[PDB]
Design a protein around this ligand. Structure first.
Ligand SMILES: COCCNC(=O)/C=C/c1[nH]cc(C(=O)N[C@@H](CC(N)=O)c2ccc(F)c(Cl)c2)c1-c1ccc(Cl)cc1F
Length: 297
């Protein structure tokens, strides 16, 4: 099941403004972005705030800590810069920013690069210098996905941008996956063998269609750290509707559908994959008053 374990809100605020979340390196501590552009650290069990840092002058949409705990990526709604990289050792400080990229992710195997998305375009940056190494856009192969989000594969040698597979080393598009939907651009399966683009599962080796999974339509997906479970939530204000779905990552078979009966802002699992944190708005409320709910997987 998904048994509720605890709940908390942005402490001492009339309107709680949590917008996104990620577990930190420290087991019991969750990092939350807020609609006023702050980063908060909370104890997930006590529900108490520990620390607060100022990141952006607009709502944080998404954040990602590095695995080693030294770095954090944030993205905001209408700030300049839209995304930034923060150092978290010694003092919390901005290292580099990515002016117009509305989404950013670390590379996966070695976290020495950032990949940012601006519309149909990907930008790769060096973490050391902040320098833009590559711009990935091919007018002949573009799918023009409206919710494109560029990403590295597990070994960092490939990028998926706008449904196009790029070889990072040569900076060449090697394959365009055919377009089946208007919005979702896709992700790599952590197994390194498959690419999941909306409802279509493609083989990375042959570029053959392996499976169709209709329940993934319009979903953002995240895997548990172990790579055994895939979580998906349909995009619908709140980025998501009121439900998320789980699937077996080995065979794409549905496990569970959870309707939390409130709009979802974000979802994450801890490094040990024991707990799920979900940001939920207290259907289609104009009032912003989010809680973080912790669930047992
Ligand atoms: C109208 O909204 C105004 C402005 N707000 C936004 O834009 C907000 C954007 C935004 N928030 C969270 C995400 C996101 O993708 N979260 C990932 C998990 C993660 N943290 O990686 C995710 C995966 C599976 C799930 F089941 C759930 Cl519920 C969440 C996203 C998100 C949504 C769409 C895209 Cl293309 C990229 C994104 F990062």
């Amino acid at each position: 099941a998904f048994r509720p374990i605890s709940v908390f809100r942005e402490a001492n605020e009339d309107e709680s403004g949590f917008t996104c979340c990620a577990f930190s390196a420290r087991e019991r501590f969750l990092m939350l972005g807020t609609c006023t552009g702050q980063l908060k650290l909370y104890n997930v069990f006590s529900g108490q705030e520990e620390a607060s840092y100022n990141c952006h002058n607009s709502a944080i949409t998404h954040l990602e800590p590095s695995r080693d705990g030294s770095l954090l990526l944030t993205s905001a709604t209408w700030s300049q810069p839209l995304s930034a990289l923060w150092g978290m050792k010694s003092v919390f400080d901005m290292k580099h920013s990515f002016t117009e990229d509305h989404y950013v992710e670390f590379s996966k195997h070695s976290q020495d690069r950032v990949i940012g998305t601006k519309g149909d375009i990907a930008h790769i940056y060096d973490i050391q210098t902040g320098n833009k190494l590559l711009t990935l856009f091919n007018p002949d192969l573009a799918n023009n996905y409206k919710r494109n989000c560029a990403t590295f594969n597990p070994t960092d040698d490939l990028v998926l941008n706008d449904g196009v597979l790029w070889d990072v080393r040569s900076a060449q598009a090697i394959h365009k996956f055919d377009k089946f939907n208007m919005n979702i651009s896709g992700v790599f399966h952590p197994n390194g063998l498959e690419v999941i683009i909306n409802t279509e599962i493609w083989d990375l080796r042959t570029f053959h269609l392996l499976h169709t999974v209709p329940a993934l339509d319009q979903c953002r997906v995240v895997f548990n750290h172990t790579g055994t479970v895939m979580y998906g939530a349909m995009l619908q204000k709140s980025p998501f509707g009121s439900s998320f779905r789980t699937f077996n990552a080995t065979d794409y078979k549905p496990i569970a559908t959870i309707d939390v009966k409130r709009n979802i802002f974000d979802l994450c699992t801890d490094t040990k994959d024991c707990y799920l944190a979900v940001i939920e708005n207290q259907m289609d409320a104009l009032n912003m008053d989010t809680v973080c709910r912790l669930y047992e997987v």
